[PDB]
Amino acid sequence: MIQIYHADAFEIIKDFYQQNLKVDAIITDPPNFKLLEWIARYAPLVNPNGCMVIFCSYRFISYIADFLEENGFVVKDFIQWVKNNPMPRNIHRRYVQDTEFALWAVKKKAKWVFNKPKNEKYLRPLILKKTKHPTQKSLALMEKIISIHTNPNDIVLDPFMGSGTTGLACKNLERNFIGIESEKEYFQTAKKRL
């Protein structure tokens, strides 16, 4: 199944509460700032064996990890993605920025999903190199995230979906996506890409 809503994630959670909605994994790329709050409100929706994968900057990453663990989750690890072709800035005075961070947490007593192909170890999921969106996470990245932390059909929820691409990864992997967007141009971008 694929459902996209054009809504504010913070008010639409009340509808999901009454409906007793329960999703397997929350895989999202979030944008006086909380941003820790949505986590508190979307945490109840996760099934006992479920997990979260949350994109974040390293400036916020420790906060989110600690916050997650106050909400009944255990932060298992970090995942990260590197582009092969950074547009270089201040090459001589500073490190180029090729890296994107995400946090992987699971529910506290959960028996979670991992899925390693016959192969060994892990932890930099991808080597990777479309939309008009300002910040879009790529498809191949999202597809790998999903192949790992979810199973052939699980219910994946992305409260901030942007251009989608969390869904598109789910659709291609047959992963049952639900997603939300507040603004109309992004919602429709996500909609016809699906």
Place this chain on the structure above:
Amino acid sequence: MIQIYHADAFEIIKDFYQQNLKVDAIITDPPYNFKLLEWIARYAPLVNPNGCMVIFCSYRFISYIADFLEENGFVVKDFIQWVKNNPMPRNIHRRYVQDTEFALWAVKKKAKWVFNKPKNEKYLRPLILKSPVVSGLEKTKHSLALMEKIISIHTNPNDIVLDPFMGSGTTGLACKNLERNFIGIESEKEYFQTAKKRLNL
């Protein structure tokens, strides 16, 4: 130059205060209520106008360290990171292997900092090394080529590098081979003396 002290860093910082000690770069690997973020507040005054800090941390502490650093008059430029060629591995089938070590790079606020990129172009992952063997000693917080690359980048040959928690002295030894003028402190004597034997008494 190489000088090592055996002391509690929080106890020796007062001595450094009145001794008017000034160090160019604090490159350290701290240990992990508290608030072992405070040493940062206390060791900040010792850093020269153009100086910098490099602080090893878990991704669980990295955001805290970053914000505190920037409250003490430093600007966080970036993070640096190291990957082992040889993870053990542990808990493979159920989990990610642990191959990574994180550190934070900040500079004093209006500083003209060092960096030093070789004519060779980019990253952000100073080194993927093999993890220590016959340089490997007796301590679990223990790597050298990493410290040498960290130093080759964020310091210049005659600068003064301070490691308030020096552990086995892997920062001192790196400084020595790169001719970098090391100062270091250690609380434990088995660690202090090993470092002392690594830097040639």
